[PDB]
Subunit: 234 residues, 4 copies
């Protein structure tokens, strides 16, 4: 099975599998059952931004979600990620819907990785718009780019109405070398902006930024509450 | 056949096929017969640096090669590259040896691409050292990374002595989107540092930075004087 | 007197002093009488973007202005800027109004300078919003930042209505080293976004990005058609 | 008195004032008596690198010092720096000698600051060499740049032999805005490389990277063990 590190924006509480009884952001280390969570004042219909960062000296994975003119939500987890992840990874965004649904629209995405052992090795990309058929993305499941240059991670109709029972992911094409033996320091930083809109009283299921082994794929039975990341709820 | 734009550092003059009677840097648009050339005061055995840049407004492809404490060599060619290249490309370094030989050692390589249609789309990578089996490079022909973390584009012995009759290329794994319809401006910048050492009175054949269609491969019969780039000398 | 290199967005034609009979973008080398001009399809009331770039190998100063969903305007001038400018400069934006007026609102500004003689020396800044009293800007004349986090280079009223007879400039606080002896290559890149709105049939006078000697100041009698840059019309 | 946050590379143990009985790296919050320390396997005569990073979500200030082919030294301190520092700061390097001495040579220095409230405000600079009279640095006390393009923070002779009883500091010219009200996330990153050589059995006194209020100056009586940062030993 895949090795996954993720920051989930979980719009739908599945208390059955450990979710708190509210919308929340969480840090997932190798399991859908977050190591750390925080309550998320979800602003359905408004543009959000998520920012995630880590470095190997501090060993502290942190995430913040904010909307214009609102309180931010932060979560942090102390973890040595080079003991969790392989040296080469792909980074991606994932989203799902289930019985309940929402648009999982990514409007921009940027990522920087640095690895030092003069002078640091690095990878940086940014998308403020995604072309149709972006050749530097691996689109998995239902993921597509729409006519507006936005990434629709889950199925959306002609008008833009979200559909249930969907999974989609977008990975950056190039593997990233996130650690080496005798590296001095390695660090990464990711940001995305998202629009989550719904006709439903309870939107589902959420959006994640995740880091996995390079050949990662959507696991069988990972729909809905498993966010396209995990084959089970352990 | 591939679509190639290259800046060649041509160490060996093949007057037979248009080379001036001296070592030279050149700008190659779709043919080994450079559109523009300049005499290159080659410092065999010393670390060089090459820098290449372009933008779509200025439409002027420029390259400079320098060594510590020596005169630089510049070449420029006025060309609209978005009329030459496809929209998605891979960028690479190539080198050859023939009957005469030299090490074609790349010590570092960095590249930035920006495409604007807020806010610009971009790709940047840098290597100050290359791991063995770098997963973000496509190594073609004889190309390998050595124990020192340097890229050896052509065959080199245990001690580091160069071998003749060799071809090698290294492409960055992710395609780069270098143009779009209604783009405002698109630009790129590449730098590499190289060590060319030889036991021969005349080193051969040279090193290139090149931009090609994404599935580019080493053409049959492109050895020696064709620098791993072209199937013929037209 | 100051040494000025500028890209002017000239909204008001002063044929008296060399302006074409239309709104235009121009490249000004040491005089308000542009070395190169292009007709500018001014979209009064809409957000514009301007991008300017140069490098010392290509020796070609280029600028492009665009609005969402419209044709871009480009201008270029072949010039060796290291023969014009001192080695240390300040970079700024300037604007004026005269008898006729317009808002000269800067919404964002970013700049990168690189100087290579391993590894390149560099300066980069970006503002997507400007605080009140920005300590890293030198504000000259009427220039101020407003409550929205935008830079108002010329006087604007409580409601936001533009005022005539105004001059204002904003310089980045730190001098930039744009050339050195035996530099391999030096390059810069600047972008800004602007909103020019007017109640007048003919807006005036325009907005510039400029590069000058470090202690540059607004010259006596440089109002209106002289864009805050030049003491005279020679 | 100044507000100081610093990472000290303390070569000389002053147990009198809290130093451990060995060379150490430390995190200084508003006092020479470090909040956090780690033993430093000082490699006198060899080129070191120091890297320092912080972000406002993680709230963890971290530093690592390394030499080629040796074990790194890391230190971290949990601290909300936006409760310590003003919003606008200058960043600098400082060094001292006392009765015992060492060269405090800075070979390169780079710094990135980002402040987000689209899209983040930022400042980045890098020096791989320092010109004589660098106009973007404020040199305080004995600090100068030498003929090799290196920064000598303390007095050095014609041949390069270090002198005792010296203080010197180098600040970047532009203030940096490291926090704002309702910022989402703010982060910084600094790296420098240093050469500490000595004819003495015990080198003294060390080198710091520090962040202070903008008009910071070398305090009276801050020589030797106070590293040019503090007026007293409290
Ligand atoms: O999209 C919201 C959720 O829908 C389903 O779980 C249910 C949530 N409320 C229900 C009510 C009835 C039934 Br049957 C089911 Cl499966 C559910 C499942 O698809 C979950 O994976 C998902 O988290
Ligand atoms: O490496 C130098 C050159 O060697 C060969 O061309 C020759 C250069 N001098 C010669 C002398 C004799 C013969 Br046969 C040949 Cl093929 C050559 C060929 O391999 C060329 O492609 C290459 O440029
Ligand atoms: O703002 C537009 C222009 O206004 C003035 O020039 C005039 C343009 N039309 C006029 C009509 C009458 C008189 Br008087 C004047 Cl000065 C002008 C001057 O202030 C010019 O510097 C400026 O370019
Ligand atoms: O440079 C090393 C140290 O030298 C001095 O302190 C002493 C260290 N060993 C000593 C021995 C004798 C005397 Br007197 C003094 Cl002041 C010292 C002082 O200058 C200290 O500030 C500094 O840390
Ligand atoms: Ca859930
Ligand atoms: Ca040749
Ligand atoms: Ca005019
Ligand atoms: Ca000490
Ligand atoms: Mn959850
Ligand atoms: Mn980089
Ligand atoms: Mn694209
Ligand atoms: Mn960050
Ligand atoms: Mn409900
Ligand atoms: Mn040639
Ligand atoms: Mn970028
Ligand atoms: Mn690597
Ligand atoms: Mn460049
Ligand atoms: Mn010969
Ligand atoms: Mn004009
Ligand atoms: Mn830089
Ligand atoms: Mn600010
Ligand atoms: Mn550009
Ligand atoms: Mn008119
Ligand atoms: Mn100490
Ligand atoms: Mn930036
Ligand atoms: Mn300089
Ligand atoms: Mn870092
Ligand atoms: Mn001792």
């Amino acid at each position: 099975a895949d090795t996954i590190v993720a920051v989930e924006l979980d719009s739908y509480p599945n208390t059955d599998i450990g979710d708190p009884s509210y919308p929340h952001i969480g840090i997932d280390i190798k399991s859908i059952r977050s190591k750390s969570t925080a309550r998320w004042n979800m602003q359905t219909g408004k543009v959000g931004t998520a920012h995630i960062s880590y470095n190997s000296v501090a060993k502290r994975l942190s995430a913040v979600v904010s909307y214009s003119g609102t309180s931010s939500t932060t979560v942090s987890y102390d973890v040595d990620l080079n003991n969790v992840l392989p040296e080469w990874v792909r980074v991606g965004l994932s989203a799902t819907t289930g019985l309940y649904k929402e648009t999982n629209t990514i409007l921009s995405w940027s990522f920087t990785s640095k690895l030092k052992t003069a002078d640091a090795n690095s990878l940086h990309f940014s998308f403020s718009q995604f072309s149709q058929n972006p050749k530097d993305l691996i689109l998995q499941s239902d993921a597509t780019t729409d006519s507006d240059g936005n990434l629709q991670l889950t199925r959306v109709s002609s008008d833009g109405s979200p559909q249930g029972s969907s999974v989609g992911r977008a990975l950056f094409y190039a593997p990233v070398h996130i650690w080496e033996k005798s590296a001095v320091v390695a660090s990464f930083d990711a940001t995305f902006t998202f629009l989550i809109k719904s006709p439903d009283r309870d939107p589902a299921d959420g959006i994640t930024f995740f880091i996995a082994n390079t050949d990662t794929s959507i696991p069988s039975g990972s729909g809905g509450r498993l966010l396209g990341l995990f084959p089970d709820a352990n």
